[PDB]
């Protein structure tokens with residue numbers, strides 16, 4: 001079945017976990033502690049020396065976005081056709097770009113850069129509000145009328161930003177409604193409220 | 209057909225151009241100069257405020273990797289099945305990670321960081337040498353026995369590093385043979401030797 005090997009944080013695995021949970025999929029968590037990681041053997045076996053590591057049967061994958069795309073492809077969360085598939089990728093790449101900035105802030109200069117980051121936030125969130133407005137008036141999902149892996153990644157990105165800058169979504173009616181709507185999905189709602197999710201720190205350095 | 213809107217540099221469009229050229233595809237280039245870009249209107253219309261912008265009929269795409277994935281999907285350069293597709297993504301994500309570091313070096317601290325970067329290079333290139341060794345002894349492509357969009361992206365990444373650090377591939381027999389083999393493909397060879405490619409700077413700041 002599925003196995004995700006990762007540190008005891010939400011980080012880059014939050015989206016894929018929400019996806020699995022929401023799609024009613026079963027998976028095993030292999031927690032890697034800072035001690036275990038610093039030992040060296042695991043890191044050494046990792047293709048790019050980083051986690052998450054994911055296993056689907058005997059298929060072993062690295063890179064969170066590769067895992068998301070793999071699940072999107074195998075579970076049918078990759079658009080209804082090629083055109084939509086391209087759009088889903090475009091959304092995900094945008095999410096990834098902002099995620100990199102967020103990660104950089106959190107681990108590079110949280111104290112000093114937090115203000116400038118929050119100031120620039122609206123500009124970074126606008127593209128997604130726009131994408132939503134062009135898709136059935138932002139009533140369904142980010143691309144098309146069926147959920148995609150990009151939706152889970154974007155949802156995660158929005159939720160963690162809500163924590164970073166409370167109220168940042170107030171200026172974006174579509175994104176706000178979107179978050180509320182996706183957060184209300186039965187299986188996803190249950191998962192987001194569970195200890196498994198709630199009791200894990202967002203990041204590894206305690207900053208959020 | 210296809211239209212790529214980009215600055216007069218190879219940059220993030222080199223791989224997709226090599227792909228189109230090698231697959232015998234026709235495309236139109238819309239050159240955007242620094243003056244035109246600083247005017248503001250174009251940037252404002254770009255989803256994430258950045259180029260390249262790509263058009264396939266009326267499908268307008270942004271993000272180089274989305275473009276590569278779209279072409280890989282429509283032209284059949286995405287593995288023979290899902291498993292291979294996942295591996296192709298994993299390779300491409302790895303290429304993208306190193307590309308970001310390269311871009312950062314080139315535009316952030318070329319003079320000061322060039323030495324440390326070149327020193328760390330072997331460690332960054334090793335994963336690809338490994339992937340190659342596990343695939344028919346590195347005799348064919350990066351994944352499977354048919355070319356994929358990841359091959360073009362990786363080829364570009366290697367070629368630009370050859371320029372940055374001449375001889376960096378000497379320690380990697382498989383990567384070296386791989387580059388020579390792919391560079392010899394008829395259509396690709398012609399393209400790499402053409403003014404269209406040769407007379408374009410690798411990066412926008414003249415550093416390489």
Ligand SMILES: N[C@@H](CCC(=O)N[C@@H](CS)C(=O)NCC(=O)O)C(=O)O
Pocket residue numbers: 011012043049050051052062063064065301305
């Ligand atoms: N591009 C990779 C990055 C993976 C990554 O950043 N991994 C970090 C944790 S989120 C890690 O393993 N750090 C430990 C190390 O590199 O030593 C992905 O998207 O999965």
Ligand SMILES: N[C@@H](CCC(=O)N[C@@H](CS)C(=O)NCC(=O)O)C(=O)O
Pocket residue numbers: 093097219220251257258259260270271272273
């Ligand atoms: N993640 C995007 C990044 C695009 C990007 O970095 N674009 C740069 C040129 S390579 C750009 O348009 N810079 C102009 C600007 O942002 O003002 C991609 O992979 O295409």
